[PDB]
Structure formats: structure tokens, C-alpha cells
Amino acid sequence: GVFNCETETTSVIPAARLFKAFILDGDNLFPKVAPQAISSVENIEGNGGPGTIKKISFPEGFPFKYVKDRVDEVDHTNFKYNYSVIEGGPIGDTLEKISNEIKIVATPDGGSILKISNKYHTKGDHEVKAEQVKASKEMGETLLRAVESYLLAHSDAYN
Amino acid sequence: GVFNCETETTSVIPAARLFKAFILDGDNLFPKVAPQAISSVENIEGNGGPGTIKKISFPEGFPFKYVKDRVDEVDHTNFKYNYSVIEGGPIGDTLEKISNEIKIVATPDGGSILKISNKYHTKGDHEVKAEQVKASKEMGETLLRAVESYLLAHSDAYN
């Protein structure tokens, strides 16, 4: 089956700056701001753009050890990041892939919203494990808030 | 905020027949085949077509007492049913409405899939309550199970 979750999350950080930090420099920034959540990010194949395979490792004590993501598209004009979760983490049993999009949209107040879509491909009749959707939400919100906190403390970062 | 949940549910019933029973005659069918889930369905305005407002009442001890739904569109050829939850139930606090789109599509084995989209308009930063996502999912499953079972027991119905 196919299951799609589209969510919106508010950030006080302006869209362009958040896109630079959260998306463009995620590999370097995530282990810096959220070391307790992300151990490392490394490129398995490629540089960082379309086709690139990256391994994101988590610290011991988490439900998962790692995920492999494939970079699908990085739209700098529309602040849009498309990627797929293709190995590790929740991939296994009845879940084959998660196809993700993160779009960072400026808001009238000078802040931003992250428009996030997670498209799950499950085996035939099977449904998405509810604990994964929830844990994915927690991991994402954790990273965002850690990025936010860093940016607010470092006005010179990602100008 | 805006939150969208899109799900697929498999049915053993052919698309045309499921549409006729589950969608076109649900008002009549649901309280008869699933009285433990739906107590009554009454039109306030119209007769089931676009613009119809209907009150759906739930059994005692269900978290909610009723919802009002507005019928948005009914496509008899393409098996589409669009409707909005506008009052009662989960509507209140930080949720203004749920816009729903149902599409019934044939499968090669002679059965069908219900593609369901539930779009939640929440207040500002507030997230959709996961309990409503669960309740919407479980209500759908319950009603489909009851309708399928009825149709399988009555081969002359809606054929």
C-alpha cells in the first residue's frame, strides 16, 4: 500500500537561513547541534546532490542504528529537499521505502513553516507502524529545535 | 496549520458496487449494518447530493455524540466522494474542519481500493491530535468491514 502524511511545523527562523542550515548544511550541522540524536552523517556514494547515498548513524540506545538516505532533488529557489529512506531504520519487514519532501516556506511574520511529506510504501495490505510515524515526528522536531537554538545563539551562522 | 493524511484500504467488493452501497446508500446502510458504530444518519439540508448537510449520531459511550458533515461532491462515474466534517466530534478547540476525499478504484482481481484523504485545518501552530487520526482510521475500517460482510451475505443487494 501507499500511505502519505503531510505535516506543517512552525519555525521562528527565516526560510532562506533555515534552508541553508537545516538542509544545505544538515550533514555538518545535525551532529553538531543534536549530537545525542545524530552520531554522524557520511556520504556512501556521491557528493551531496541528486543520486547521493548518505548514511545517518544514531547513538546506542535508540530504536534504530542507522538509516541510508538517497538525495533525490535539492531545489535552492523553492527551498525544497526531496530524499528517500532506503535502508536501515524502519526499512524492513513490511516497509520498503519512505519518499520524503521538506519544503521551507517563509511566513508573513518573517519566520517559516516546514511543509513535510512522508510517503510510505508498505507491503500489500499492511499499514504503517504507528510508533514509526510518531518517532519520526519526534526525531524531526528534535533536530529542528536544536538547529533553531543554535542559529539564535549564533547570529553570524548561515547569514 | 494544514495536515493531510492519505491512506489506502483494500476491499474485496468491486468498485462500482462498493460505491453504490458504501457511498450512495451509506446513510441507510451504516446504522443497519454497524449500529455499534453509527446510531443514525439524518439530512438537515438536501438529500445526499452536493451541499447536503447531514447529522451522524454515535452510540452512547463513544467519545463523541455526533458530527455534522457537508457533502462537497459526488462523482458517480469516477467513484469520488468529497465531504467535510464541520461540526461536532473532533471539531472544536484547535480544529476547524476536516476535508475528506474518497476515491474508489478497481483492482485487477475484481476488488477495489478506497483511497482516502483527510485534510485537517488546525489552529496556527497546533498539531492534529493523533487520537483523531486513529479514530478516523478505526471508524473507516469498522464501517467497511460491516458493509463488506453485508454485501457478501446479500448477493442481490446493490448489484
Side-chain angles (χ1 to χ4, degrees):
Chain A
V2 173
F3 301 93
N4 186 32
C5 182
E6 303 178 335
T7 59
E8 289 184 349
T9 310
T10 304
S11 176
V12 76
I13 307 301
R17 177 160 190 239
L18 191 60
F19 184 71
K20 283 178 187 186
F22 194 81
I23 302 300
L24 299 185
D25 203 34
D27 299 4
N28 292 132
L29 195 60
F30 293 144
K32 196 160 83 176
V33 303
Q36 79 288 349
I38 306 296
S39 175
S40 60
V41 183
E42 66 190 301
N43 295 326
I44 301 306
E45 278 189 348
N47 265 351
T52 301
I53 310 299
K54 67 172 72 171
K55 179 179 177 180
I56 298 98
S57 297
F58 312 115
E60 287 287 345
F62 277 72
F64 307 127
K65 189 191 197 173
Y66 78 96
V67 290
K68 286 179 178 162
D69 290 353
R70 176 188 67 219
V71 180
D72 297 321
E73 192 187 348
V74 192
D75 185 339
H76 291 238
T77 302
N78 294 295
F79 312 129
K80 195 166 56 58
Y81 182 57
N82 289 262
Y83 69 103
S84 302
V85 181
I86 68 172
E87 198 190 290
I91 306 304
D93 191 21
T94 59
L95 184 64
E96 183 257 336
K97 199 160 78 162
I98 320 175
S99 304
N100 291 333
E101 180 179 297
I102 302 173
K103 185 188 191 59
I104 310 193
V105 181
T107 55
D109 76 338
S112 65
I113 295 166
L114 291 79
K115 296 185 176 178
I116 300 174
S117 175
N118 309 133
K119 186 186 162 190
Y120 299 82
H121 172 222
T122 63
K123 190 182 184 172
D125 294 340
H126 291 281
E127 59 160 17
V128 186
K129 287 179 167 79
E131 65 269 37
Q132 161 57 36
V133 172
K134 184 175 161 183
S136 176
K137 199 198 88 192
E138 308 308 305
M139 173 63 74
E141 285 177 356
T142 294
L143 289 167
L144 175 57
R145 301 318 172 202
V147 167
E148 276 196 332
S149 182
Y150 183 86
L151 292 176
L152 291 180
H154 298 86
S155 68
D156 51 319
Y158 308 92
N159 293 346
Chain B
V2 176
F3 295 83
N4 189 24
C5 188
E6 299 180 328
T7 61
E8 292 181 334
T9 303
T10 62
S11 176
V12 78
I13 308 300
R17 182 161 186 239
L18 187 68
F19 190 78
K20 207 167 295 186
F22 191 83
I23 300 303
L24 299 179
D25 206 36
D27 293 13
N28 173 40
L29 261 190
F30 294 143
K32 288 178 172 171
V33 305
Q36 82 294 336
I38 303 296
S39 190
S40 61
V41 186
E42 178 208 322
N43 295 327
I44 311 161
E45 301 177 38
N47 67 342
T52 294
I53 307 287
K54 68 178 80 177
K55 185 179 178 173
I56 297 166
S57 304
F58 305 111
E60 193 79 1
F62 204 73
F64 310 126
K65 293 187 87 78
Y66 80 93
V67 288
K68 290 190 185 179
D69 289 358
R70 184 191 62 243
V71 180
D72 301 319
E73 92 170 59
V74 186
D75 187 335
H76 289 243
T77 303
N78 295 302
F79 311 145
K80 295 163 140 177
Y81 187 68
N82 299 350
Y83 72 98
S84 298
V85 183
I86 63 169
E87 199 188 288
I91 309 306
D93 190 29
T94 61
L95 179 66
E96 190 237 340
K97 70 168 178 197
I98 315 166
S99 307
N100 306 130
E101 292 176 2
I102 300 178
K103 174 85 161 110
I104 305 178
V105 298
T107 54
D109 70 351
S112 60
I113 289 170
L114 298 97
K115 295 177 174 188
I116 303 172
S117 173
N118 314 124
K119 188 163 287 175
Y120 300 80
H121 168 215
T122 68
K123 184 176 185 173
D125 296 338
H126 296 274
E127 296 160 22
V128 175
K129 298 168 186 186
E131 61 194 339
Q132 170 54 26
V133 171
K134 291 177 194 287
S136 180
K137 183 178 76 70
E138 287 172 353
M139 178 60 84
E141 297 169 355
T142 295
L143 292 174
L144 182 65
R145 178 184 291 109
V147 170
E148 283 190 333
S149 186
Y150 177 89
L151 293 174
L152 292 181
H154 298 94
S155 67
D156 53 340
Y158 310 97
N159 74 336

PDB file of all heavy atoms in Angstrom, chain A residues 1-8 10 125 127 130 137 141, chain B residues 1-8 10 125 127 134 137 141:
ATOM      1  N   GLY A   1       0.824  -1.243   0.000  1.00  0.00           N
ATOM      2  CA  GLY A   1       0.000   0.000   0.000  1.00  0.00           C
ATOM      3  C   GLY A   1       0.839   1.265   0.000  1.00  0.00           C
ATOM      4  O   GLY A   1       2.056   1.212   0.174  1.00  0.00           O
ATOM      5  N   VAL A   2       0.177   2.401  -0.216  1.00  0.00           N
ATOM      6  CA  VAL A   2       0.828   3.708  -0.182  1.00  0.00           C
ATOM      7  C   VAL A   2       0.130   4.581   0.852  1.00  0.00           C
ATOM      8  O   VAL A   2      -1.095   4.743   0.822  1.00  0.00           O
ATOM      9  CB  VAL A   2       0.792   4.420  -1.558  1.00  0.00           C
ATOM     10  CG1 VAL A   2       1.316   5.845  -1.439  1.00  0.00           C
ATOM     11  CG2 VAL A   2       1.600   3.659  -2.594  1.00  0.00           C
ATOM     12  N   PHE A   3       0.919   5.134   1.769  1.00  0.00           N
ATOM     13  CA  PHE A   3       0.392   5.998   2.815  1.00  0.00           C
ATOM     14  C   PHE A   3       1.196   7.292   2.866  1.00  0.00           C
ATOM     15  O   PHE A   3       2.425   7.262   2.948  1.00  0.00           O
ATOM     16  CB  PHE A   3       0.383   5.264   4.157  1.00  0.00           C
ATOM     17  CG  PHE A   3      -0.444   4.005   4.145  1.00  0.00           C
ATOM     18  CD1 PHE A   3       0.141   2.770   3.860  1.00  0.00           C
ATOM     19  CD2 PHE A   3      -1.816   4.052   4.392  1.00  0.00           C
ATOM     20  CE1 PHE A   3      -0.622   1.611   3.832  1.00  0.00           C
ATOM     21  CE2 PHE A   3      -2.583   2.897   4.367  1.00  0.00           C
ATOM     22  CZ  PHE A   3      -1.985   1.673   4.090  1.00  0.00           C
ATOM     23  N   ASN A   4       0.491   8.418   2.791  1.00  0.00           N
ATOM     24  CA  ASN A   4       1.112   9.738   2.699  1.00  0.00           C
ATOM     25  C   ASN A   4       0.676  10.630   3.852  1.00  0.00           C
ATOM     26  O   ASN A   4      -0.518  10.815   4.093  1.00  0.00           O
ATOM     27  CB  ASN A   4       0.774  10.398   1.354  1.00  0.00           C
ATOM     28  CG  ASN A   4       1.499  11.719   1.138  1.00  0.00           C
ATOM     29  OD1 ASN A   4       2.619  11.916   1.601  1.00  0.00           O
ATOM     30  ND2 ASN A   4       0.863  12.625   0.406  1.00  0.00           N
ATOM     31  N   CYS A   5       1.539  11.250   4.596  1.00  0.00           N
ATOM     32  CA  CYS A   5       1.331  12.109   5.758  1.00  0.00           C
ATOM     33  C   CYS A   5       1.797  13.581   5.511  1.00  0.00           C
ATOM     34  O   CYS A   5       3.210  13.487   5.365  1.00  0.00           O
ATOM     35  CB  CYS A   5       2.014  11.449   6.937  1.00  0.00           C
ATOM     36  SG  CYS A   5       1.817  12.307   8.456  1.00  0.00           S
ATOM     37  N   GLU A   6       1.209  14.396   5.329  1.00  0.00           N
ATOM     38  CA  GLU A   6       1.689  15.750   5.066  1.00  0.00           C
ATOM     39  C   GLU A   6       1.480  16.619   6.304  1.00  0.00           C
ATOM     40  O   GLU A   6       0.362  16.738   6.805  1.00  0.00           O
ATOM     41  CB  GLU A   6       1.006  16.338   3.828  1.00  0.00           C
ATOM     42  CG  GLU A   6       1.200  15.495   2.571  1.00  0.00           C
ATOM     43  CD  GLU A   6       0.475  16.043   1.352  1.00  0.00           C
ATOM     44  OE1 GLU A   6      -0.529  16.769   1.510  1.00  0.00           O
ATOM     45  OE2 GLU A   6       0.908  15.736   0.223  1.00  0.00           O
ATOM     46  N   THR A   7       2.571  17.192   6.811  1.00  0.00           N
ATOM     47  CA  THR A   7       2.537  17.967   8.056  1.00  0.00           C
ATOM     48  C   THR A   7       3.121  19.360   7.869  1.00  0.00           C
ATOM     49  O   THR A   7       3.866  19.610   6.920  1.00  0.00           O
ATOM     50  CB  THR A   7       3.313  17.277   9.203  1.00  0.00           C
ATOM     51  OG1 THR A   7       4.683  17.091   8.820  1.00  0.00           O
ATOM     52  CG2 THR A   7       2.694  15.933   9.567  1.00  0.00           C
ATOM     53  N   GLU A   8       2.781  20.257   8.789  1.00  0.00           N
ATOM     54  CA  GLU A   8       3.360  21.600   8.825  1.00  0.00           C
ATOM     55  C   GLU A   8       3.929  21.891  10.211  1.00  0.00           C
ATOM     56  O   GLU A   8       3.260  21.660  11.222  1.00  0.00           O
ATOM     57  CB  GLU A   8       2.316  22.648   8.433  1.00  0.00           C
ATOM     58  CG  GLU A   8       1.944  22.629   6.955  1.00  0.00           C
ATOM     59  CD  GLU A   8       0.974  23.731   6.565  1.00  0.00           C
ATOM     60  OE1 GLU A   8       0.415  24.391   7.466  1.00  0.00           O
ATOM     61  OE2 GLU A   8       0.764  23.932   5.349  1.00  0.00           O
ATOM     62  N   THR A  10       6.107  24.884  12.513  1.00  0.00           N
ATOM     63  CA  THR A  10       6.487  26.291  12.591  1.00  0.00           C
ATOM     64  C   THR A  10       7.926  26.477  13.073  1.00  0.00           C
ATOM     65  O   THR A  10       8.372  25.817  14.014  1.00  0.00           O
ATOM     66  CB  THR A  10       5.517  27.070  13.507  1.00  0.00           C
ATOM     67  OG1 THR A  10       4.176  26.888  13.034  1.00  0.00           O
ATOM     68  CG2 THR A  10       5.840  28.564  13.517  1.00  0.00           C
ATOM     69  N   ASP A 125      -1.396  -5.164   1.840  1.00  0.00           N
ATOM     70  CA  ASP A 125      -2.475  -4.681   2.710  1.00  0.00           C
ATOM     71  C   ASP A 125      -1.985  -4.030   4.008  1.00  0.00           C
ATOM     72  O   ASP A 125      -2.766  -3.366   4.706  1.00  0.00           O
ATOM     73  CB  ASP A 125      -3.451  -5.823   3.053  1.00  0.00           C
ATOM     74  CG  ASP A 125      -4.222  -6.337   1.841  1.00  0.00           C
ATOM     75  OD1 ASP A 125      -4.314  -5.615   0.830  1.00  0.00           O
ATOM     76  OD2 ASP A 125      -4.748  -7.470   1.904  1.00  0.00           O
ATOM     77  N   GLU A 127      -0.352  -1.854   7.058  1.00  0.00           N
ATOM     78  CA  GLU A 127      -0.350  -0.438   7.411  1.00  0.00           C
ATOM     79  C   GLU A 127       0.992  -0.022   8.003  1.00  0.00           C
ATOM     80  O   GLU A 127       1.777  -0.864   8.452  1.00  0.00           O
ATOM     81  CB  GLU A 127      -1.494  -0.106   8.382  1.00  0.00           C
ATOM     82  CG  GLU A 127      -1.457  -0.873   9.698  1.00  0.00           C
ATOM     83  CD  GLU A 127      -2.270  -0.214  10.802  1.00  0.00           C
ATOM     84  OE1 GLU A 127      -3.123   0.652  10.504  1.00  0.00           O
ATOM     85  OE2 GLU A 127      -2.051  -0.570  11.979  1.00  0.00           O
ATOM     86  N   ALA A 130       2.466   2.632  13.598  1.00  0.00           N
ATOM     87  CA  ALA A 130       2.147   3.923  14.224  1.00  0.00           C
ATOM     88  C   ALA A 130       3.284   4.501  15.071  1.00  0.00           C
ATOM     89  O   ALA A 130       3.440   5.724  15.153  1.00  0.00           O
ATOM     90  CB  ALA A 130       0.875   3.812  15.051  1.00  0.00           C
ATOM     91  N   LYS A 137       8.282  11.875  13.794  1.00  0.00           N
ATOM     92  CA  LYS A 137       7.862  13.222  14.169  1.00  0.00           C
ATOM     93  C   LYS A 137       8.758  13.778  15.276  1.00  0.00           C
ATOM     94  O   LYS A 137       9.188  14.930  15.205  1.00  0.00           O
ATOM     95  CB  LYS A 137       6.395  13.223  14.617  1.00  0.00           C
ATOM     96  CG  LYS A 137       5.727  14.593  14.593  1.00  0.00           C
ATOM     97  CD  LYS A 137       4.465  14.621  15.446  1.00  0.00           C
ATOM     98  CE  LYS A 137       4.773  14.982  16.893  1.00  0.00           C
ATOM     99  NZ  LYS A 137       3.623  14.737  17.808  1.00  0.00           N
ATOM    100  N   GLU A 141      11.325  16.964  14.950  1.00  0.00           N
ATOM    101  CA  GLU A 141      11.098  18.126  15.807  1.00  0.00           C
ATOM    102  C   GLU A 141      12.307  18.402  16.702  1.00  0.00           C
ATOM    103  O   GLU A 141      12.660  19.558  16.931  1.00  0.00           O
ATOM    104  CB  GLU A 141       9.808  17.962  16.626  1.00  0.00           C
ATOM    105  CG  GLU A 141       8.543  18.173  15.796  1.00  0.00           C
ATOM    106  CD  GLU A 141       7.247  17.947  16.563  1.00  0.00           C
ATOM    107  OE1 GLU A 141       7.287  17.539  17.743  1.00  0.00           O
ATOM    108  OE2 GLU A 141       6.170  18.184  15.972  1.00  0.00           O
TER     109      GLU A 141
ATOM    110  N   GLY B   1      -2.680  25.481  11.137  1.00  0.00           N
ATOM    111  CA  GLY B   1      -1.888  24.689  10.153  1.00  0.00           C
ATOM    112  C   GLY B   1      -2.725  23.779   9.275  1.00  0.00           C
ATOM    113  O   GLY B   1      -3.936  23.644   9.467  1.00  0.00           O
ATOM    114  N   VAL B   2      -2.068  23.170   8.294  1.00  0.00           N
ATOM    115  CA  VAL B   2      -2.708  22.205   7.399  1.00  0.00           C
ATOM    116  C   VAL B   2      -2.023  20.852   7.563  1.00  0.00           C
ATOM    117  O   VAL B   2      -0.794  20.755   7.539  1.00  0.00           O
ATOM    118  CB  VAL B   2      -2.666  22.663   5.920  1.00  0.00           C
ATOM    119  CG1 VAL B   2      -3.260  21.605   4.999  1.00  0.00           C
ATOM    120  CG2 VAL B   2      -3.420  23.971   5.747  1.00  0.00           C
ATOM    121  N   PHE B   3      -2.830  19.817   7.769  1.00  0.00           N
ATOM    122  CA  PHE B   3      -2.322  18.460   7.893  1.00  0.00           C
ATOM    123  C   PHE B   3      -3.139  17.536   7.014  1.00  0.00           C
ATOM    124  O   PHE B   3      -4.370  17.579   7.034  1.00  0.00           O
ATOM    125  CB  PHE B   3      -2.357  17.997   9.345  1.00  0.00           C
ATOM    126  CG  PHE B   3      -1.436  18.766  10.246  1.00  0.00           C
ATOM    127  CD1 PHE B   3      -1.824  19.992  10.786  1.00  0.00           C
ATOM    128  CD2 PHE B   3      -0.174  18.267  10.559  1.00  0.00           C
ATOM    129  CE1 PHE B   3      -0.973  20.704  11.618  1.00  0.00           C
ATOM    130  CE2 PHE B   3       0.681  18.977  11.391  1.00  0.00           C
ATOM    131  CZ  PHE B   3       0.280  20.195  11.919  1.00  0.00           C
ATOM    132  N   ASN B   4      -2.447  16.719   6.229  1.00  0.00           N
ATOM    133  CA  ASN B   4      -3.098  15.817   5.293  1.00  0.00           C
ATOM    134  C   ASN B   4      -2.650  14.380   5.522  1.00  0.00           C
ATOM    135  O   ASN B   4      -1.456  14.086   5.538  1.00  0.00           O
ATOM    136  CB  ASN B   4      -2.806  16.249   3.854  1.00  0.00           C
ATOM    137  CG  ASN B   4      -3.619  15.481   2.827  1.00  0.00           C
ATOM    138  OD1 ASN B   4      -4.688  14.949   3.125  1.00  0.00           O
ATOM    139  ND2 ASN B   4      -3.112  15.430   1.598  1.00  0.00           N
ATOM    140  N   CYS B   5      -3.570  13.458   5.728  1.00  0.00           N
ATOM    141  CA  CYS B   5      -3.322  12.027   5.895  1.00  0.00           C
ATOM    142  C   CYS B   5      -3.761  11.141   4.705  1.00  0.00           C
ATOM    143  O   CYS B   5      -5.146  11.416   4.696  1.00  0.00           O
ATOM    144  CB  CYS B   5      -3.897  11.555   7.227  1.00  0.00           C
ATOM    145  SG  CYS B   5      -3.439   9.875   7.595  1.00  0.00           S
ATOM    146  N   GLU B   6      -3.227  10.623   3.923  1.00  0.00           N
ATOM    147  CA  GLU B   6      -3.737   9.864   2.782  1.00  0.00           C
ATOM    148  C   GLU B   6      -3.493   8.369   2.974  1.00  0.00           C
ATOM    149  O   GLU B   6      -2.362   7.939   3.191  1.00  0.00           O
ATOM    150  CB  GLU B   6      -3.101  10.350   1.473  1.00  0.00           C
ATOM    151  CG  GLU B   6      -3.391  11.808   1.139  1.00  0.00           C
ATOM    152  CD  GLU B   6      -2.746  12.268  -0.155  1.00  0.00           C
ATOM    153  OE1 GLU B   6      -1.652  11.777  -0.501  1.00  0.00           O
ATOM    154  OE2 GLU B   6      -3.335  13.137  -0.828  1.00  0.00           O
ATOM    155  N   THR B   7      -4.565   7.586   2.910  1.00  0.00           N
ATOM    156  CA  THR B   7      -4.489   6.153   3.171  1.00  0.00           C
ATOM    157  C   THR B   7      -5.103   5.357   2.034  1.00  0.00           C
ATOM    158  O   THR B   7      -5.901   5.881   1.248  1.00  0.00           O
ATOM    159  CB  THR B   7      -5.204   5.759   4.483  1.00  0.00           C
ATOM    160  OG1 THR B   7      -6.592   6.110   4.400  1.00  0.00           O
ATOM    161  CG2 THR B   7      -4.569   6.443   5.689  1.00  0.00           C
ATOM    162  N   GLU B   8      -4.720   4.087   1.952  1.00  0.00           N
ATOM    163  CA  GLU B   8      -5.349   3.146   1.035  1.00  0.00           C
ATOM    164  C   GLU B   8      -5.885   1.960   1.820  1.00  0.00           C
ATOM    165  O   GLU B   8      -5.200   1.424   2.692  1.00  0.00           O
ATOM    166  CB  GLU B   8      -4.364   2.685  -0.039  1.00  0.00           C
ATOM    167  CG  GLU B   8      -3.962   3.790  -1.008  1.00  0.00           C
ATOM    168  CD  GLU B   8      -3.007   3.317  -2.084  1.00  0.00           C
ATOM    169  OE1 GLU B   8      -2.265   2.338  -1.850  1.00  0.00           O
ATOM    170  OE2 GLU B   8      -2.993   3.932  -3.170  1.00  0.00           O
ATOM    171  N   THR B  10      -7.920  -1.781   1.220  1.00  0.00           N
ATOM    172  CA  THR B  10      -8.359  -2.774   0.239  1.00  0.00           C
ATOM    173  C   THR B  10      -9.731  -3.329   0.583  1.00  0.00           C
ATOM    174  O   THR B  10     -10.047  -3.574   1.751  1.00  0.00           O
ATOM    175  CB  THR B  10      -7.356  -3.933   0.080  1.00  0.00           C
ATOM    176  OG1 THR B  10      -7.228  -4.637   1.319  1.00  0.00           O
ATOM    177  CG2 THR B  10      -6.001  -3.402  -0.354  1.00  0.00           C
ATOM    178  N   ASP B 125      -0.182  27.070  15.181  1.00  0.00           N
ATOM    179  CA  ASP B 125       0.915  26.125  15.445  1.00  0.00           C
ATOM    180  C   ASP B 125       0.469  24.720  15.857  1.00  0.00           C
ATOM    181  O   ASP B 125       1.280  23.786  15.853  1.00  0.00           O
ATOM    182  CB  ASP B 125       1.837  26.668  16.547  1.00  0.00           C
ATOM    183  CG  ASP B 125       2.547  27.952  16.156  1.00  0.00           C
ATOM    184  OD1 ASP B 125       2.680  28.236  14.944  1.00  0.00           O
ATOM    185  OD2 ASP B 125       2.988  28.672  17.080  1.00  0.00           O
ATOM    186  N   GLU B 127      -0.865  21.014  16.328  1.00  0.00           N
ATOM    187  CA  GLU B 127      -0.824  19.784  15.539  1.00  0.00           C
ATOM    188  C   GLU B 127      -2.192  19.110  15.549  1.00  0.00           C
ATOM    189  O   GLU B 127      -3.008  19.364  16.442  1.00  0.00           O
ATOM    190  CB  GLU B 127       0.213  18.817  16.120  1.00  0.00           C
ATOM    191  CG  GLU B 127       1.653  19.311  16.069  1.00  0.00           C
ATOM    192  CD  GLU B 127       2.565  18.584  17.044  1.00  0.00           C
ATOM    193  OE1 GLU B 127       2.237  17.447  17.455  1.00  0.00           O
ATOM    194  OE2 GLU B 127       3.618  19.151  17.402  1.00  0.00           O
ATOM    195  N   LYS B 134      -6.273   8.169  14.609  1.00  0.00           N
ATOM    196  CA  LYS B 134      -6.606   6.786  14.972  1.00  0.00           C
ATOM    197  C   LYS B 134      -8.109   6.513  14.883  1.00  0.00           C
ATOM    198  O   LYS B 134      -8.525   5.495  14.324  1.00  0.00           O
ATOM    199  CB  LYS B 134      -6.103   6.452  16.382  1.00  0.00           C
ATOM    200  CG  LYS B 134      -4.593   6.365  16.516  1.00  0.00           C
ATOM    201  CD  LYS B 134      -4.179   6.098  17.957  1.00  0.00           C
ATOM    202  CE  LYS B 134      -2.690   6.334  18.174  1.00  0.00           C
ATOM    203  NZ  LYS B 134      -1.832   5.280  17.562  1.00  0.00           N
ATOM    204  N   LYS B 137      -9.340   6.418  11.322  1.00  0.00           N
ATOM    205  CA  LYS B 137      -8.888   5.173  10.705  1.00  0.00           C
ATOM    206  C   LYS B 137      -9.754   3.991  11.144  1.00  0.00           C
ATOM    207  O   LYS B 137     -10.238   3.227  10.305  1.00  0.00           O
ATOM    208  CB  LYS B 137      -7.408   4.913  11.015  1.00  0.00           C
ATOM    209  CG  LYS B 137      -6.834   3.671  10.341  1.00  0.00           C
ATOM    210  CD  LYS B 137      -5.349   3.494  10.633  1.00  0.00           C
ATOM    211  CE  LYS B 137      -5.093   2.973  12.042  1.00  0.00           C
ATOM    212  NZ  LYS B 137      -5.523   1.555  12.211  1.00  0.00           N
ATOM    213  N   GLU B 141     -12.384   1.484   8.978  1.00  0.00           N
ATOM    214  CA  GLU B 141     -12.229   0.025   8.985  1.00  0.00           C
ATOM    215  C   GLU B 141     -13.494  -0.687   9.471  1.00  0.00           C
ATOM    216  O   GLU B 141     -13.948  -1.648   8.850  1.00  0.00           O
ATOM    217  CB  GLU B 141     -11.029  -0.391   9.846  1.00  0.00           C
ATOM    218  CG  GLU B 141      -9.684   0.119   9.343  1.00  0.00           C
ATOM    219  CD  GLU B 141      -8.558  -0.072  10.346  1.00  0.00           C
ATOM    220  OE1 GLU B 141      -8.819  -0.517  11.486  1.00  0.00           O
ATOM    221  OE2 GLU B 141      -7.398   0.231   9.992  1.00  0.00           O
TER     222      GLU B 141
END
